[PDB]
Nucleic acid binder design. Structure first.
Ligand SMILES: [Mg+2]
Ligand SMILES: [Mg+2]
Ligand SMILES: [Mg+2]
Ligand SMILES: [Mg+2]
Ligand SMILES: [Mg+2]
Ligand SMILES: [Mg+2]
Ligand SMILES: [Mg+2]
Ligand SMILES: [Mg+2]
Ligand SMILES: [Mg+2]
Ligand SMILES: [Mg+2]
Ligand SMILES: [Mg+2]
Ligand SMILES: [Mg+2]
Ligand SMILES: [Mg+2]
Ligand SMILES: [Mg+2]
Ligand SMILES: [Mg+2]
Ligand SMILES: [Mg+2]
Ligand SMILES: [Mg+2]
Ligand SMILES: [Mg+2]
Ligand SMILES: [Mg+2]
Ligand SMILES: [Mg+2]
Ligand SMILES: [Mg+2]
Ligand SMILES: [Mg+2]
Ligand SMILES: [Mg+2]
Ligand SMILES: [Mg+2]
Ligand SMILES: [Mg+2]
Ligand SMILES: [Mg+2]
Ligand SMILES: [Mg+2]
Ligand SMILES: [Mg+2]
Ligand SMILES: [Mg+2]
Ligand SMILES: [Mg+2]
Ligand SMILES: [Mg+2]
Ligand SMILES: [Mg+2]
Ligand SMILES: [Mg+2]
Ligand SMILES: [Mg+2]
Ligand SMILES: [Mg+2]
Ligand SMILES: [Mg+2]
Ligand SMILES: [Mg+2]
Ligand SMILES: [Mg+2]
Ligand SMILES: [Mg+2]
Ligand SMILES: [Mg+2]
Ligand SMILES: [Mg+2]
Ligand SMILES: [Mg+2]
Ligand SMILES: [Mg+2]
Ligand SMILES: [Mg+2]
Ligand SMILES: [Mg+2]
Ligand SMILES: [Mg+2]
Ligand SMILES: [Mg+2]
Ligand SMILES: [Mg+2]
Ligand SMILES: [Mg+2]
Ligand SMILES: [Mg+2]
Ligand SMILES: [Mg+2]
Ligand SMILES: [Mg+2]
Ligand SMILES: [Mg+2]
Ligand SMILES: [Mg+2]
Ligand SMILES: [Mg+2]
Ligand SMILES: [Mg+2]
Ligand SMILES: [Mg+2]
Ligand SMILES: [Mg+2]
Ligand SMILES: [Mg+2]
Ligand SMILES: [Mg+2]
Ligand SMILES: [Mg+2]
Ligand SMILES: [Mg+2]
Ligand SMILES: [Mg+2]
Ligand SMILES: [Mg+2]
Ligand SMILES: [Mg+2]
Ligand SMILES: [Mg+2]
Ligand SMILES: [Mg+2]
Ligand SMILES: [Mg+2]
Ligand SMILES: [Mg+2]
Ligand SMILES: [Mg+2]
Ligand SMILES: [Mg+2]
Ligand SMILES: [Mg+2]
Ligand SMILES: [Mg+2]
Ligand SMILES: [Mg+2]
Ligand SMILES: [Mg+2]
Ligand SMILES: [Mg+2]
Ligand SMILES: [Mg+2]
Ligand SMILES: [Mg+2]
Ligand SMILES: [Mg+2]
Ligand SMILES: [Mg+2]
Ligand SMILES: [Mg+2]
Ligand SMILES: [Mg+2]
Ligand SMILES: [Mg+2]
Ligand SMILES: [Mg+2]
Ligand SMILES: [Mg+2]
Ligand SMILES: [Mg+2]
Ligand SMILES: [Mg+2]
Ligand SMILES: [Mg+2]
Ligand SMILES: [Mg+2]
Ligand SMILES: [Mg+2]
Ligand SMILES: [Mg+2]
Ligand SMILES: [Mg+2]
Ligand SMILES: [Mg+2]
Ligand SMILES: [Mg+2]
Ligand SMILES: [Mg+2]
Ligand SMILES: [Mg+2]
Ligand SMILES: [Mg+2]
Ligand SMILES: [Mg+2]
Ligand SMILES: [Mg+2]
Ligand SMILES: [Mg+2]
Ligand SMILES: [Mg+2]
Ligand SMILES: [Mg+2]
Ligand SMILES: [Mg+2]
Ligand SMILES: [Mg+2]
Ligand SMILES: [Mg+2]
Ligand SMILES: [Mg+2]
Ligand SMILES: [Mg+2]
Ligand SMILES: [Mg+2]
Ligand SMILES: [Mg+2]
Ligand SMILES: [Mg+2]
Ligand SMILES: [Mg+2]
Ligand SMILES: [Mg+2]
Ligand SMILES: [Mg+2]
Ligand SMILES: [Mg+2]
Ligand SMILES: [Mg+2]
Ligand SMILES: [Mg+2]
Ligand SMILES: [Mg+2]
Ligand SMILES: [Mg+2]
Ligand SMILES: [Mg+2]
Ligand SMILES: [Mg+2]
Ligand SMILES: [Mg+2]
Ligand SMILES: [Mg+2]
Ligand SMILES: [Mg+2]
Ligand SMILES: [Mg+2]
Ligand SMILES: [Mg+2]
Ligand SMILES: [Mg+2]
Ligand SMILES: [Mg+2]
Ligand SMILES: [Mg+2]
Ligand SMILES: [Mg+2]
Ligand SMILES: [Mg+2]
Ligand SMILES: [Mg+2]
Ligand SMILES: [Mg+2]
Ligand SMILES: [Mg+2]
Ligand SMILES: [Mg+2]
Ligand SMILES: [Mg+2]
Ligand SMILES: [Mg+2]
Ligand SMILES: [Mg+2]
Ligand SMILES: [Mg+2]
Ligand SMILES: [Mg+2]
Ligand SMILES: [Mg+2]
Ligand SMILES: [Mg+2]
Ligand SMILES: [Mg+2]
Ligand SMILES: [Mg+2]
Ligand SMILES: [Mg+2]
Ligand SMILES: [Mg+2]
Ligand SMILES: [Mg+2]
Ligand SMILES: [Mg+2]
Ligand SMILES: [Mg+2]
Ligand SMILES: [Mg+2]
Ligand SMILES: [Mg+2]
Ligand SMILES: [Mg+2]
Ligand SMILES: [Mg+2]
Ligand SMILES: [Mg+2]
Ligand SMILES: [Mg+2]
Ligand SMILES: [Mg+2]
Ligand SMILES: [Mg+2]
Ligand SMILES: [Mg+2]
Ligand SMILES: [Mg+2]
Ligand SMILES: [Mg+2]
Ligand SMILES: [Mg+2]
Ligand SMILES: [Mg+2]
Ligand SMILES: [Mg+2]
Ligand SMILES: [Mg+2]
Ligand SMILES: [Mg+2]
Ligand SMILES: [Mg+2]
Ligand SMILES: [Mg+2]
Ligand SMILES: [Mg+2]
Ligand SMILES: [Mg+2]
Ligand SMILES: [Mg+2]
Ligand SMILES: [Mg+2]
Ligand SMILES: [Zn+2]
Lengths: 112, 101, 59, 140, 151, 116
RNA sequence: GGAUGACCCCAGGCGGUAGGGGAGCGUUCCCGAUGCCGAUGAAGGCCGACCCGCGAGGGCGGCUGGAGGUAAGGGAAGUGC
RNA sequence: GUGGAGCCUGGGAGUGAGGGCGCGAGCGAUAACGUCCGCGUCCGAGCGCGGGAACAACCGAGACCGCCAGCUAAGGCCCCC
RNA sequence: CGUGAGGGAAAGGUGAAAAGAACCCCGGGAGGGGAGUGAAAUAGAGCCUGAAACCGUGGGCUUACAAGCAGUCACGGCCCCGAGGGGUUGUGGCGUGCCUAUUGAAGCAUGAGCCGGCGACUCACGGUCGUGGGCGAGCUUAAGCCGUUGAGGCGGAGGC
């Protein structure tokens, strides 16, 4: 049995969040909660919301138990980029990509 | 008992019970052929000079086939020369029946 | 200067090998001896306001 | 019929008294033994030669004026860093290096040849520590 | 094409490839090289060939037994079921396609809607239609004009 | 009528790409690099099936030579003696004999010394 | 040889840039077609260590797809990166 | 002397920057990886193969495909090989 | 975009039907998870198909004494599907990218970041040869006219 949550179109760059996601892959729900809580990265606010949402789904829709939950899989895919103009010297216009993430957390139960 | 036989410009060490692919022989599937013997070894040793007069190896042809395709490709740089050929070498499958020493 | 510039595109292999040092180390945490909540060592506990066995702070 | 390939074999240890032998003419034989080419099941992509122990390397011989004129060479990578050390001096300081260096150049370059060279065990003076191996003495 | 003739950017020193106008066929949106233009595919095939051709085609059906001449068409007075009756009686069950040639308008109307029937006036007899169909059926009056045309 | 590229080019590229399975980086990933890699690959294969014929015979010879010297002669002598004796067993076979069948190999050695 | 490009047999030629010549493959469209294949699944996509072909290619199978496709023989080109 | 010989009529070209080497000269300095002719060759187009450490034109030799068979060529046969 | 004359884009498709997802759950929201609709929901509106480059998670094999146009030939190890095949690659052998231009390029000479799509020998009229047919001291019609409405015929002026 598995419970999942996907946060789509989060306005933060995939490479930045993955770094935070990698910190909790395989951890117990409790450990992951601590880690995010004292991870000094913006990404942590977002991963924490997907975790907690998956956890809720586990308990409320899928008949799993909070105390047995662990991050079975987590990954960050890239959404569509926001393209923005960054004006440079000499008439040049650069294009900044303000990138976008779809964050997935999947919880399982660590039985016995 | 083993024999060293010669078929298809090539030489093989055969023992009875052996299946062997050789160059294509002109003999119906199910036929039986006599291969020449160049050397017999095992219990007794007899040495052809080059073949041994009395001996022959008896083979039943199980069938004839085509080898898995080998692509033969040719390329020369800077000259737009390219060639691609598919090659399947024909062969015969033999079961080695007996060594008539 | 004369505007140096990459000579070849970096391979996926190379790029990712540069990143072999990029993994975050998780926050170091110890239990608060008063309320058992996990926290950074050497900090006043933000769950209960306790540090050095006493109440330091309203939380 | 495919050509025979040997399964792993137990390597044979061998012992050679270098005393009075001609450096180069000994080295070629040591090389053959290390490649394993005296063996009828020689296979070029596995180490399956002998381990070779040599003793009395300090008593190797050399013809002509080579003790004075043969120069060994080492490059450090630094400006002016080419050291030239002559046979005489090399024998007087690291005698086992003379045979070692000659055999090394007669082994293949590559991962295997490097490994083959580790199977050579050269000693100045009559003794060696490979008693446990009970190396078979060879006249060559 | 609709674009202007301005050279889009200077010949040299831009770091880009040289171009002229964006109508050039090398641009998405540009013109097409050697595309089709309005055309006349017709040509005057020799008259004798058409003639010899007509005749051979009718000849070919004749040699097969598939050419049938008829005097008149019974009761066919412009109704499909009428032609259908007559046809059955004439050996045309509709298992074989028929090029029906007659000047009787009343007969063409009756037969035209049948999937297996192509109708023509005799002035229209032509080899594609004969060759497209399995059986050739003609009025004598039709057969008469065809004989005058292959003369 | 118009005949747009359509389906045709993707299909040629997949063909080549599929042959390039296994190659490093863009060599299995980019049609262009794959195709380059393949030109080289086909020529090597051709060249190398030629030299496999040589690679093996060199091996047979090193093996025969080892087996000869156990009986006190060299490869060159052994081959001349075989010739003179009229023995035509080839080196692929002489080699299998030398390893799998020492008694037979010995006898051929004998005929070879004797034949000179 | 047999009569005819049916296939067998013997022999010989077969490195190639510019370039000449020959034979084919595939794309879009037309006749074939008021037909035929098709929801028991069109085209298209993704796989395949299978079959045919020297090759370009063509089959066949599984998955995807969900409404089209189109033979033998011919015809015509916005036809192959 | 039956050869991818020759000759005749016609269709289609491409080429009209060559280069190394050997021999014969001129020019140059009995210089040049020089230059300019002649006869030949090879590379060009044989940057396919063996030898020459490596190397278009030096030596060996003209690659239709396959073989875990045999004989040689130049060059080699102490080890690398 | 340009003072202006003037330049001048991109951008189509849920489903048969909105039945366009009530209500609950996490969340500030966005987003998701259930529930529900539908033949189908990786048809959920950022909607048919959904290739490729590109980014990731999971697994098999492999890699920290090794020298490399990245392959190829050989053998052996491991993993997989079941005298065989497939994947992987340790060691050994061999090995100077593609295209262009050149006497000659791996060349330290040009061009190309990669991928998809667009992208260059045609058409008319005349000519010249060849070729498939028709007629042959003859061959052939043009414009037009009649017919048809994807039907053909007439038309001899004229041309060779
Ligand atoms: Mg931190
Ligand atoms: Mg909860
Ligand atoms: Mg400004
Ligand atoms: Mg950029
Ligand atoms: Mg950017
Ligand atoms: Mg065969
Ligand atoms: Mg074979
Ligand atoms: Mg090239
Ligand atoms: Mg090359
Ligand atoms: Mg080229
Ligand atoms: Mg060239
Ligand atoms: Mg080429
Ligand atoms: Mg400067
Ligand atoms: Mg600088
Ligand atoms: Mg400055
Ligand atoms: Mg700079
Ligand atoms: Mg640079
Ligand atoms: Mg990259
Ligand atoms: Mg990666
Ligand atoms: Mg790097
Ligand atoms: Mg504590
Ligand atoms: Mg020895
Ligand atoms: Mg070898
Ligand atoms: Mg020392
Ligand atoms: Mg080497
Ligand atoms: Mg305009
Ligand atoms: Mg215009
Ligand atoms: Mg306009
Ligand atoms: Mg203009
Ligand atoms: Mg203008
Ligand atoms: Mg202008
Ligand atoms: Mg310029
Ligand atoms: Mg640039
Ligand atoms: Mg440009
Ligand atoms: Mg540019
Ligand atoms: Mg320009
Ligand atoms: Mg232009
Ligand atoms: Mg212009
Ligand atoms: Mg324009
Ligand atoms: Mg247009
Ligand atoms: Mg347009
Ligand atoms: Mg165009
Ligand atoms: Mg044009
Ligand atoms: Mg144009
Ligand atoms: Mg045109
Ligand atoms: Mg018109
Ligand atoms: Mg025309
Ligand atoms: Mg006309
Ligand atoms: Mg009808
Ligand atoms: Mg019909
Ligand atoms: Mg179309
Ligand atoms: Mg195109
Ligand atoms: Mg297209
Ligand atoms: Mg395509
Ligand atoms: Mg292509
Ligand atoms: Mg495709
Ligand atoms: Mg294709
Ligand atoms: Mg690989
Ligand atoms: Mg790759
Ligand atoms: Mg890559
Ligand atoms: Mg890729
Ligand atoms: Mg290829
Ligand atoms: Mg080959
Ligand atoms: Mg070769
Ligand atoms: Mg000896
Ligand atoms: Mg001989
Ligand atoms: Mg022999
Ligand atoms: Mg040719
Ligand atoms: Mg021809
Ligand atoms: Mg042609
Ligand atoms: Mg066909
Ligand atoms: Mg095509
Ligand atoms: Mg075609
Ligand atoms: Mg059309
Ligand atoms: Mg129709
Ligand atoms: Mg239809
Ligand atoms: Mg049906
Ligand atoms: Mg259905
Ligand atoms: Mg289906
Ligand atoms: Mg199609
Ligand atoms: Mg289509
Ligand atoms: Mg296919
Ligand atoms: Mg399909
Ligand atoms: Mg329809
Ligand atoms: Mg069709
Ligand atoms: Mg057709
Ligand atoms: Mg037709
Ligand atoms: Mg075009
Ligand atoms: Mg002739
Ligand atoms: Mg000729
Ligand atoms: Mg000629
Ligand atoms: Mg032409
Ligand atoms: Mg010209
Ligand atoms: Mg020219
Ligand atoms: Mg000129
Ligand atoms: Mg000139
Ligand atoms: Mg010149
Ligand atoms: Mg010349
Ligand atoms: Mg000249
Ligand atoms: Mg030179
Ligand atoms: Mg000359
Ligand atoms: Mg001379
Ligand atoms: Mg001279
Ligand atoms: Mg002169
Ligand atoms: Mg001088
Ligand atoms: Mg010169
Ligand atoms: Mg000179
Ligand atoms: Mg001179
Ligand atoms: Mg010359
Ligand atoms: Mg040239
Ligand atoms: Mg040559
Ligand atoms: Mg030549
Ligand atoms: Mg070449
Ligand atoms: Mg050479
Ligand atoms: Mg060489
Ligand atoms: Mg060499
Ligand atoms: Mg050469
Ligand atoms: Mg030839
Ligand atoms: Mg020999
Ligand atoms: Mg010689
Ligand atoms: Mg040598
Ligand atoms: Mg060495
Ligand atoms: Mg202005
Ligand atoms: Mg304005
Ligand atoms: Mg303008
Ligand atoms: Mg545009
Ligand atoms: Mg719709
Ligand atoms: Mg609609
Ligand atoms: Mg429907
Ligand atoms: Mg809320
Ligand atoms: Mg919502
Ligand atoms: Mg959720
Ligand atoms: Mg929902
Ligand atoms: Mg339902
Ligand atoms: Mg259904
Ligand atoms: Mg789907
Ligand atoms: Mg769908
Ligand atoms: Mg989209
Ligand atoms: Mg649809
Ligand atoms: Mg879609
Ligand atoms: Mg999609
Ligand atoms: Mg994809
Ligand atoms: Mg992975
Ligand atoms: Mg080392
Ligand atoms: Mg290692
Ligand atoms: Mg290798
Ligand atoms: Mg081997
Ligand atoms: Mg395997
Ligand atoms: Mg393997
Ligand atoms: Mg080479
Ligand atoms: Mg290279
Ligand atoms: Mg080179
Ligand atoms: Mg290319
Ligand atoms: Mg270029
Ligand atoms: Mg140039
Ligand atoms: Mg130049
Ligand atoms: Mg130049
Ligand atoms: Mg290079
Ligand atoms: Mg370079
Ligand atoms: Mg330059
Ligand atoms: Mg370059
Ligand atoms: Mg230039
Ligand atoms: Mg660029
Ligand atoms: Mg790329
Ligand atoms: Mg493209
Ligand atoms: Mg033309
Ligand atoms: Mg013409
Ligand atoms: Mg004509
Ligand atoms: Mg005519
Ligand atoms: Mg005229
Ligand atoms: Zn506390």
């Amino acid at each position: 049995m598995e419970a999942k949550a996907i946060a789509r179109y989060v306005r933060i760059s995939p490479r930045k969040v993955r770094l935070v996601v990698d910190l909790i892959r395989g951890k117990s729900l409790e450990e992951a909660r601590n880690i995010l809580r004292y991870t000094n990265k913006r990404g942590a606010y977002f991963v924490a919301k997907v975790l907690e949402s998956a956890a809720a789904n586990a308990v409320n829709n899928h008949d799993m138990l909070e105390d047995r939950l662990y991050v079975k899989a987590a990954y960050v895919d890239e959404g569509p980029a926001l393209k923005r103009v960054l004006p440079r010297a000499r008439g040049r216009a650069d294009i900044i990509k303000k990138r976008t993430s779809h964050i997935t957390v999947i919880l399982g139960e660590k039985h016995g | 008992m083993f024999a060293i036989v010669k078929t298809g410009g090539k030489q093989y060490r055969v023992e009875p019970g052996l299946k062997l692919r050789v160059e294509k022989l002109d003999a119906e599937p199910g036929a039986t052929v006599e291969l020449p013997v160049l050397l017999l070894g095992g219990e007794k040793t007899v040495v052809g000079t080059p073949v041994v007069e009395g001996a022959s190896v008896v083979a039943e042809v199980l069938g004839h086939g085509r080898g898995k395709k080998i692509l033969v490709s040719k390329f020369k740089a800077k000259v737009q020369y390219r060639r691609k050929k598919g090659h399947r070498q024909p062969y015969t499958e033999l079961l080695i029946k007996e060594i008539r020493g | 200067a004369k505007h140096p510039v990459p000579k070849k595109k970096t391979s996926k292999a190379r790029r990712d090998a540069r990143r072999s040092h990029h993994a975050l180390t998780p926050p170091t945490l110890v239990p608060c001896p008063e309320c058992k909540a996990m926290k950074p060592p050497h900090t006043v506990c933000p769950e209960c306001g306790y540090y050095a066995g006493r109440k330091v702070l309203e939380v | 019929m495919k050509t025979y390939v040997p399964k792993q074999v137990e390597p044979r240890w061998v012992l050679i008294d270098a005393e009075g032998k001609t450096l180069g003419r000994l080295a070629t034989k040591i090389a053959t033994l290390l490649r394993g080419k005296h063996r009828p099941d020689w296979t070029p992509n596995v180490a399956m030669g002998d381990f070779v122990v040599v003793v009395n390397a300090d008593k190797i011989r050399v013809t002509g004026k080579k003790l004075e004129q043969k120069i060994y060479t080492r490059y450090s990578g630094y400006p002016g860093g080419l050291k030239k050390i002559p046979l005489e001096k090399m024998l007087a300081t690291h005698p086992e290096r003379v045979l070692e260096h000659a055999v090394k150049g007669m082994l293949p370059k590559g991962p295997l040849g490097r490994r083959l060279f580790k199977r050579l065990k050269v000693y100045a003076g009559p003794d060696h520590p490979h008693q446990a191996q009970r190396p078979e003495k060879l006249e060559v | 094409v609709a674009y202007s003739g301005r050279k889009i950017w200077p010949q040299k020193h831009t770091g880009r490839a040289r171009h002229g106008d964006i109508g050039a066929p090398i641009f998405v949106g540009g013109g097409v090289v050697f595309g089709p233009k309005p055309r006349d595919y017709s040509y005057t095939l020799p008259k004798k060939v058409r003639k010899k051709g007509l005749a051979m085609a009718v000849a070919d059906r004749a040699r097969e037994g598939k050419l049938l001449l008829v005097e008149a068409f019974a009761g066919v007075n412009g109704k499909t079921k009428e032609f259908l009756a007559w046809a059955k009686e004439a050996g045309l069950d509709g298992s074989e396609s028929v090029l029906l040639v007659t000047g009787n308008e009343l007969v063409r109307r009756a037969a035209r809607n049948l999937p297996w029937v192509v109708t023509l006036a005799p002035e229209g007899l032509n080899v594609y239609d004969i060759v497209r169909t399995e059986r050739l059926v003609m009025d004598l009056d039709a057969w008469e004009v065809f004989q005058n045309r292959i003369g | 009528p118009r005949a747009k590229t359509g389906v045709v080019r993707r299909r040629k590229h997949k063909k080549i790409l599929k042959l390039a399975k296994g190659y490093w980086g863009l060599r299995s990933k980019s049609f262009r690099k794959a195709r380059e890699t393949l030109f080289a690959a086909g020529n090597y294969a051709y060249a190398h099936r030629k030299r496999r014929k040589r690679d093996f015979r060199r091996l047979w010879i090193v093996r025969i030579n080892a087996a000869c010297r156990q009986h006190g002669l060299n490869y060159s002598t052994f081959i001349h003696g075989l010739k003179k004796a009229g023995i035509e067993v080839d080196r692929k076979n002489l080699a299998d004999l030398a390893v799998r069948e020492p008694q037979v190999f010995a006898e051929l050695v004998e005929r070879a010394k004797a034949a000179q």
